[PDB]
Amino acid sequence: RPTWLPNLNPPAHLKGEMAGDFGFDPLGLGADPARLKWFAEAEKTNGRWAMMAVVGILGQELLGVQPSWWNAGAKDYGVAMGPLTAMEFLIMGFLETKRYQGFKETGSSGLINQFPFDPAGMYSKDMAVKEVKNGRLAMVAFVGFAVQALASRTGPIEGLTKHLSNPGYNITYNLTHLQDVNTY
Amino acid sequence: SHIVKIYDTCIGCTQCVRACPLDVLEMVPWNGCKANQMASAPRTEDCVGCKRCETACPTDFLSVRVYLGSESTRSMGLSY
Amino acid sequence: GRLAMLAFIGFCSQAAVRGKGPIDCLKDHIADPWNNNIYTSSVGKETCVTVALLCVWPIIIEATKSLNKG
Amino acid sequence: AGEVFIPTFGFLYVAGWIGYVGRLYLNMVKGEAKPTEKEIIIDVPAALRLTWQGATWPVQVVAELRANTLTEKAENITISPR
Amino acid sequence: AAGSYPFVPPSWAPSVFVPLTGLVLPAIAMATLFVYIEKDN
Amino acid sequence: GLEPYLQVCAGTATMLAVGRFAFLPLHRRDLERSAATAGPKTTGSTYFDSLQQEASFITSTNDPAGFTLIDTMAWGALGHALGFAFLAASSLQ
Amino acid sequence: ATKLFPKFSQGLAQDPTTRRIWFGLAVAHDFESHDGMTEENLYQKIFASHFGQLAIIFLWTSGNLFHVAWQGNFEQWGADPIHVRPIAHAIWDPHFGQPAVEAFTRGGASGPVNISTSGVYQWWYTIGMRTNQDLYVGSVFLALVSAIFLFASWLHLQPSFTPSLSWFKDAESRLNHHLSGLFGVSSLAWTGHLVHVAIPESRGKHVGWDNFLTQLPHPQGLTPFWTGNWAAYAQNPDSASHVFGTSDGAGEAILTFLGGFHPQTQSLWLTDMAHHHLAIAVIFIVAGHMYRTNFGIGHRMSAILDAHVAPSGRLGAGHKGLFETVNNSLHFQLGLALASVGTICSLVAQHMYSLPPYAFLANDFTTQASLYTHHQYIAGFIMCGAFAHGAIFWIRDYDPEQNKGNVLARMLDHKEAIISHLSWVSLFLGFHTLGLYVHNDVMQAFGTPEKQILIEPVFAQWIQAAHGKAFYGFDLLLSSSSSSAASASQTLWLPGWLDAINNNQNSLFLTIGPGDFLVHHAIALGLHTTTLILVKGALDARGSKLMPDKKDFGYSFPCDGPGRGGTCDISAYDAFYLAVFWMLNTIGWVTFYFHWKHLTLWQGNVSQFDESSTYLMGWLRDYLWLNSSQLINGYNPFGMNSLSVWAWIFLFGHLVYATGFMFLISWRGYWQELIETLVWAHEKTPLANLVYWKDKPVALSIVQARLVGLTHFSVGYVFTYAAFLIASTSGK
Amino acid sequence: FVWAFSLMFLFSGRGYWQELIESIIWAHSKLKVAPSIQPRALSITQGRAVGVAHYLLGGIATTWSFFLARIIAV
Ligand code: CHL
Ligand code: CLA
Ligand code: CLA
Ligand code: CLA
Ligand SMILES: CC1=C(/C=C/C(C)=C\C=C\C(C)=C/C=C/C=C(C)\C=C\C=C(C)\C=C\C2=C(C)C[C@@H](O)CC2(C)C)C(C)(C)CCC1
Ligand SMILES: CC1=C(/C=C/C(C)=C/C=C/C(C)=C/C=C/C=C(C)/C=C/C=C(C)/C=C/C2=C(C)CCCC2(C)C)C(C)(C)CCC1
Ligand SMILES: CC1=C(/C=C/C(C)=C\C=C\C(C)=C\C=C\C=C(C)\C=C\C=C(C)/C=C/C2=C(C)CCCC2(C)C)C(C)(C)CCC1
Ligand SMILES: CC1=C(C/C=C(\C)CCC[C@H](C)CCC[C@H](C)CCCC(C)C)C(=O)c2ccccc2C1=O
Ligand code: SF4
Ligand code: SF4
Ligand code: SF4
Ligand SMILES: [Ca+2]
Secondary structure, three states: OOOOOOOOOOOOOOOOOOOOOOOOOOOOOOOOHHHHHHHHHHHHHHHHHHHHHHHHHHHHHHHOOOOOOOOOOOOOOOOOHHHHHHHHHHHHHHHHHHHHHHHHOOOOOOEOOEOOOOOOOOOOHHHHHHHHHHHHHHHHHHHHHHHHHHHOOOOHHHHHHHHOOOOOOOHHHHOOOHHHHOEO | OOEEEEOOOOOOOOOOHHHOOOOOOEEEOOOOOOOOOEEEOOOOOOOOOOOOOHHHOOOOOOOEEEEOOOOOOOOOOOOO | OOOOOOOOOOOOEOOEOOOOOOHHHHHHHHHOOOOOOHHHOOOHHHHHHHHHHHOOHHHHHOOOOOOOOO | OOOOHHHHHHHHHHHHHHHHHHHHHHHHHOOOOOOOHHHHOOOHHHHHHHOHHHOOHHHHHHHHHOOOOOOOOOOOOOOOOO | OOOOOOOOOOOOOHHHHHHHHHHHHHHHHHHHHHHHHHOEO | OOOHHHHHHHHHHHHHHHHHHHHHHHHHHHHHHHHHHHOOOOOOOOOOHHHOOOOOHHHOOOOHHHOOHHHHHHHHHHHHHHHHHHHHHHHOO | OOEOOOOOOHHHHHOOEOHHHHHHHHOOOOHHHOOOOOHHHHHHHHHHHHHHHHHHHHHHHHHHHHHHHHOOOHHHHHHOOOOOOOEEEEOOOOOOOHHHHHHOOOOOOOOOEEEOOOOHHHHHHHOOOOOHHHHHHHHHHHHHHHHHHHHHHHHOOOOOOOOOHHHHOOHHHHHHHHHHHHHHHHHHHHHHHHHHHHHHHHOOOOOOOOOOOOEOOOOOOOHHHHHOOHHHHHOOOOOOOOOOOOOOOOOOOOOOOOOOOOOOOOOOOHHHHHHHHHHHHHHHHHHHOOEOOOOOOOEOHHHHHHOOOOOOOOOOOEOOOOHHHHHOOHHHHHHHHHHHHHHHHHHHHHHHHHOOOOOOOOOOHHHHHHHHHHHHHHHHHHHHHHHHHHHHHHHHOOOOOOOOOEOOHHHHHOHHHHHHHHHHHHHHHHHHHHHHHHHHHHHHHOOOHHHOOOOOOHHHHHHHHHHOOOOOOOOOHHHOOOOHHHHHHOOOOHHHHHHHHOOOOOOOOOOOOHHHHHHHHHHHHHHHHHHHHHHHHHHOOOOOOOOOOOHHHOOOOOOOOOOOOOOOOOOOHHHHHHHHHHHHHHHHHHHHHHHHHHHHHHHOOHHHHHHHOOOHHHHHHHHHHHHHHHHHHHEEOOEEOOOHHHHHHHHHHHHHHHHHHHHHHOOOOHHHHHHHHHHHHHHHOOOOOOOOOOOEOOOOOHHHHHHHHHHHHHHHHHHHHHHHHHHHHHOO | OHHHHHHHOOOOOHHHHHHHHHHHHHHHHHOOOOOOOOOOOOOHHHHHHHHHHHHHHHHHHHHHHHHHHHHHHO
């Protein structure tokens, strides 16, 4: 079985059964099964939200929405943030309580009532290994999208189209030339 | 109720018995002393914790020991 | 026994409170709903906070049997 | 030096003198018949024959350290149960 | 619900909190505990 | 040249090399006697306390003399604090 | 019949007397004694109890911020901190009369309010807070933190989240995490506040949550840090012309080592406080990576303790067999913790008067005095608990066979040596320290002040000269510039430390005279005596010629009866009970010396202390009697002023203090028989016989009355002094 | 001083003093200076008497000085 560490010793709890098991548990956080079971749905769902988000930060920018993804929140949207966020609490609150209820029962994901949510099927081992792995890449990406906004103040695509343009403009230039980006 | 214990260091002097104010101790027969007697504490349910018996124990340290513990109407000696 | 007497609960102004009269508030909301809601009112901040808290109480209560008394 | 310094030894000499004479008497009445009745009714004669003996107390005290007689053996002093 | 901070207590808050905490609240606590303390087993 | 690289690199290299061939054997010997003899074994059993139990990735290095990742991050860490104490000291003081 | 109140103690639950109610509140947090107690359950309960205490602390802090913001003058005080008086809260007293409503309107308010002596204002200003919103936001934040800890107390008590005893006994890791994370990452994190918010705010520049990700803390940025040229962060320090909260005289440094104090604030510089937390944070994180965990590299604590045995065998088996003793005893650990916290609690008071760490802290004399006295007293109670729990360890959790020849078992071996030697030092300090006070008093009474003995504290004056004090003229170390130490620091904090230490308008190394010599030795007497009382009780906790079976009788037992002459107060609880009085006496002398040395400093009449302190009569008439003149006149037949509450408390303290005497002077017996007569009267009284008691009325327990009287005695000593310390310092 | 000194016998107990004396006797028996008569702490009743005596002596003496110096001076 593939291992993150060359010549690794997969911990007892990390069995090949799980999706992208590469034996990665330097601290054995999921040594307990129940926690590991929840952690795996909380890995999949953190990734589901990060894939969606990363797609936005790229897409929004690619089309050309005006405020940078980080400044997008501060905009003249036609709604007071108060009631807006209030509704946000109602829609997501239900959309989430239903999910938890179903997960509390069917130990899988879903939407509201349609659990084992498939409307197409595609719940194979391969597709679910892809999800866990595309998710992990997306979760790592969003953490990038955030620090390239802090240290360099450039959107994801614009950042690639500046390191490809000038092979320099790297973490060795941005951190050192922060004075330009930030203000005193 | 207080806990009264008679240790082997008893000489069967019967002084602790003739000292108890609520008949908690009595003298029973034994073989480890030349007086062939060893005080027993049959009714520690009437012990008030006065420790008069200890003040009457002549043996090194104390052969009779009263360990004041739980308190009841009798243990607190309440006539209320 | 829970009843739709909640209209007459905040009867201070019936459906609304300290804001116009009764059926007039409805017409106002239809006109501009986002700018004609309790959240966009004197008690808007507290209402938003309470609404949010209520939308968590279920999960808080429906956790690992997260309940108690004594 | 006249302040504190010199005065310091002066007290120490008399202090040790008083203490040494006291122990000399105590250790003489120990043994003697009823040692407890010579502490209440002090033997003024023998108490008056030991007062001057404490004049050279430092000389005698050291001679006792360098002879192991100033202190008692640890296996002859009663100690409270640990 | 005014000015900047929307949770600044009203001027009548002291004329309610101080009376409740020190007269009403304590009475409930003392009475409730009294019953528990004397509660039979 | 004499940029942070010169100071940081040298410190890291020296500590790693001195801890990979010089103190490495003493380091291993001290680890043994300390954890096996005078100190016993912890995490007896029961509970999800396996967290205190030793990992495994640390005990997986083909590197001869068993220079584990923790050892590389140990001597190297000591080295990255000498590279930055030498450069920093020359900065002011 | 059986009651339910004492669920933990069935004996108390079945108790027919009222003692069940009193003890039920006492034996409540002594789980080790609770019916059906397992070691793991005990640890889990304690762990959750810790969360509860952490919820109270944060909830308490949030309340202070809220009342300071809702009912305070922060912005006004911030504008003029040397004229405006910080307002703690408002006085809504439904009993206040109109003159009371008028007199208590101060510090700029529209109603009766209470000025604060906690010094939160000066602290919150120095750390970056400037408006009431900053306080409201902080209060909400801390309140949320309190809620989180409260849920955690529940979560860690519900199966599957309850830590095993093994986790509770995982020391190597706990210490590593606490030293690196709790102590280190919380100091570097603080440097991050200082460098990013506090320092900019002090230089007049709002760097709050709205613009922190865009505001460069240093003009150059992280470049100097990365390039290694760390010095760039120590260039252009704030000039002496700098004004806190203003760009006036503002510099650009973020981490420096100037030393001394900011000129206007008269408090340690922020940059020097930033670099401190950065330096200590680095040490803590590195220190955290020491003990072994689950990776390999590391030190097993047991090995270190066992490997430290003196080869000469002077310390017997040394520290061998001590790891289990500390790991398996929760009283030994608690004692060490209280001892460490207690001692550091005193360092905070001794280092915060000399070096004010907050802006305009020195200006506020009342705050300074009430903060020293607060910590010095809290420290004393903590120290009493240290020895207290140590004695409990000796009886409840000490295995004499496992600890055989270890440094802990060879202590009881020379228990008499330790106790007796502490007796000689106490007597020597007592007979002489007092004798040279009565001698001076006699000379003062006979009008022969020259004849009074005034020994000079030369040893302390030399330690002062060593630090750079020149008044004495000893030219030692820093005092001598041509020295090695003096020359070495001449390019760092030295230039400032001297300027500040050689200024007599502050409290850095204050000129000491022969008056300080006597009081300092008196403080030593209290330290040695209080220690002797606690040490004697700890060593004799489970052994004694009078009571050789004290361990069998537990820790808190009234007496062993009138046998063997008298066993009154023979329990190791009564070494604590008695040590408390000496602790209050000791701290009393220290907090009276602070106040007088400083009141004379602040009034400008330093000669007053330099002379009256020599004799005891001066301490009473020139200090207690003279200063009490205003406090006592808070309310007189002609009117009342804002010091009325302190005058009322001052008398209130005396009342509680005197009430404590009855429970200590009088004993259980006269009261018991008296209660018997009262029981008879009620049963015979008509119309009242109808109502009856569910619990039989009994007199307070022998040990109970000891603690009840002591609580009254302590409360008095605190309120009576707090009144003086605050109403005499504020009145002027 | 006398009034306050009385609160060491009115607030304490022989148990503590008796054992304390035991340690002192040890020091005396080491240097071989132990007194022939056995040093014993004051009886329970004695300590009650000593404290009340010093307590009354101290308080009355304080008032005696107060009254006399007040009325003789004015
Ligand atoms: C549903 C309504 C909703 C509204 C009206 C807004 C509005 C805003 N978002 Mg936000 N958000 C909303 C939901 C959520 N956001 C986020 C995650 C983010 C990110 C990652 C960022 C924003 C940011 C912003 C602000 C951009 C301007 C600025 O500089 O910050 C002024 C406004 C704020 C600082 C508010 C954010 C407070 C705090 C950082 C929240 C931290 C927890 C979560 C990110 C979400 C909290 C709850 C949601 C409803 C706000 C803006 C006013 C940007 C920002 O600057 O915020 C830091 C930004 O970078 N939001 C989540 C994820 C759970 C939301 C979920 O509902
Ligand atoms: C021969 C008499 C004598 C001697 C040699 C000592 C010697 C000593 N005593 Mg001691 N003591 C004595 C009498 C004596 N005492 C008496 C009568 C009392 C009852 C008041 C005490 C009460 C006492 C206490 C409470 C303590 C000592 C302590 C000590 C030791 C500390 C040294 C010191 O500074 O002295 C200290 C002496 C005193 C504090 C008071 C005694 C001073 C008197 C005036 C001296 C005795 C003179 C004697 C009557 C002469 C007899 C002559 C004979 C011909 C009749 C020391 C070895 C301390 C200790 O134990 O150290 C560990 C200590 O705690 N003593
Ligand atoms: C990085 C990891 C980490 C961290 C940060 C912590 C942190 C903490 N643990 Mg913990 N622990 C850990 C790992 C960690 N632990 C591990 C791995 C284990 C398994 C063995 C444990 C097992 C454990 C147990 C069993 C307990 C804790 C407890 C605690 C808390 C101690 C109570 C306290 O208030 O301390 C705070 C102290 C500081 C923040 C620093 C101390 C500085 C001194 C005291 C004063 C400094 C003041 C400063 C100079 C000026 C202040 C001015 C102004 C701000 C007032 C604390 C917050 C206890 C607890 O639960 O309490 C609730 C406890 O019972 N831990
Ligand atoms: C003003 C009240 C007062 C005073 C003055 C003292 C004084 C003292 N206490 Mg104490 N205490 C007090 C209140 C007081 N306490 C209270 C209220 C409590 C709570 C119950 C305690 C509980 C307590 C404990 C538990 C202990 C002490 C101890 C001590 C002694 C410490 C050692 C020392 O300093 O030796 C110095 C000696 C002196 C200052 C005495 C001066 C010399 C005398 C007065 C001159 C000789 C007589 C003179 C010539 C004429 C007078 C007699 C004449 C009429 C015949 C000390 C003498 C410790 C102890 O016993 O020491 C081993 C100790 O264990 N105290
Ligand atoms: C130079 C001097 C002083 C310097 C003091 C310094 C730096 C150190 C002092 C150490 C001192 C004072 C004492 C150490 C003592 C240790 C021991 C083991 C000595 C115990 C003495 C004993 C046992 C003798 C007891 C006596 C015997 C047996 C018989 C008689 O002699 C009576 C008695 C009881 C004295 C300062 C304070 C400046 C000030 C200026 C005088
Ligand atoms: C493979 C192999 C080898 C080797 C190689 C190498 C290259 C090694 C090294 C490695 C390394 C490379 C290591 C290191 C480590 C380190 C770490 C992991 C850490 C770092 C850092 C630090 C420690 C820092 C800290 C701090 C900060 C953060 C800030 C400031 C302050 C201070 C500096 C303190 C050879 C070739 C011989 C051959 C064979 C094969
Ligand atoms: C409220 C209040 C208080 C309290 C406090 C406490 C107890 C705690 C807090 C805490 C806090 C509130 C903290 C803060 C935090 C924040 C943060 C922390 C952020 C940051 C950001 C960023 C962006 C960064 C990032 C990073 C890191 C983290 C690492 C390295 C790398 C980097 C730099 C990237 C007091 C009492 C004093 C008073 C006043 C009020
Ligand atoms: C201090 C104290 C003691 C100790 C008191 C003692 C030891 C009395 C002290 C009397 C003198 C100082 C001891 C020896 C008396 C000799 C007659 C003095 C001869 C010395 C020469 C100088 C003459 C108790 O025994 C006691 C008992 C019960 C409750 C409280 C207490 C209590 O508080
Ligand atoms: S304590 Fe009193 S009643 Fe009890 S056994 Fe002893 S003498 Fe008898
Ligand atoms: S007093 Fe002691 S020795 Fe005598 S009969 Fe009683 S227990 Fe036995
Ligand atoms: S008087 Fe009280 S404390 Fe003293 S022995 Fe008698 S019962 Fe015990
Ligand atoms: Ca600000």
